[PDB]
Amino acid sequence: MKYPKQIRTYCPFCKKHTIHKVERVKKRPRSELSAGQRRFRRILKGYGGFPRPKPEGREKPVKKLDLRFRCTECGKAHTRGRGFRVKKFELVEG
Amino acid sequence: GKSLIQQRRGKGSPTFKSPSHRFRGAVKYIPLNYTQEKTLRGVVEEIMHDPGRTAPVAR
RNA sequence: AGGCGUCGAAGCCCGGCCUCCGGGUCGGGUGGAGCCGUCCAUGAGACACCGCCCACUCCCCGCUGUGUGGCUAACCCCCGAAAGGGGGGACAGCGGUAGGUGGGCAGUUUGGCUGGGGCGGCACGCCUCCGAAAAGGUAUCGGAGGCGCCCUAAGGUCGGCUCAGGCGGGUCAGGAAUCCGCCGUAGAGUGCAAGGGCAAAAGCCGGCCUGACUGGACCCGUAACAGAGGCGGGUCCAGCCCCGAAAGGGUGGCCUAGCGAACCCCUGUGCCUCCCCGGUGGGGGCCAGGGAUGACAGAAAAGCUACCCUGGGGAUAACAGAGUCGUCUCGGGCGAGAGCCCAUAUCGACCCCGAGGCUUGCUACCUCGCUGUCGGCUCUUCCCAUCCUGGCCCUGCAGCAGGGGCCAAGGGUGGGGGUGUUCACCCAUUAAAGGGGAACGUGAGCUGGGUUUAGACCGUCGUGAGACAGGUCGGAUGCUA
RNA sequence: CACAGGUCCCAGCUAGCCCGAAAGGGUUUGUACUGGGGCCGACGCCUGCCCAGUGCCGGUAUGUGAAGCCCGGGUACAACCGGGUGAAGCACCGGUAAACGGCGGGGGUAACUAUAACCCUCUUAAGGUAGCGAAAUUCCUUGUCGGUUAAAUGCCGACCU
RNA sequence: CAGUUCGCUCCCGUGACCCCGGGCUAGGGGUGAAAGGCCAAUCGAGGCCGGAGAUAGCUGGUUCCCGCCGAAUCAUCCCGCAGGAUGGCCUCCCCGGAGGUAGGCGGUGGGGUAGAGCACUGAUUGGAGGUGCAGGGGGCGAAAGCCCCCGGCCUCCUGUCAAACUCCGAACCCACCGCCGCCGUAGAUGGGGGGAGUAGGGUGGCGGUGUAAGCCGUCCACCGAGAGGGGAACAACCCAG
RNA sequence: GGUUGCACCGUCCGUCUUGAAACACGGGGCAGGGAGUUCGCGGCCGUGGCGAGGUUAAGGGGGUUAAGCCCCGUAGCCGC
RNA sequence: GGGGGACCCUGAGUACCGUCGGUUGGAUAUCCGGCGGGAAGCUGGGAGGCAUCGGCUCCCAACCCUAAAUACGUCCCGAG
Ligand SMILES: [Zn+2]
Question: What ranges of residues constitute the C4-type zinc fingers (chain A)?
Answer without folding.
Answer: 11-74
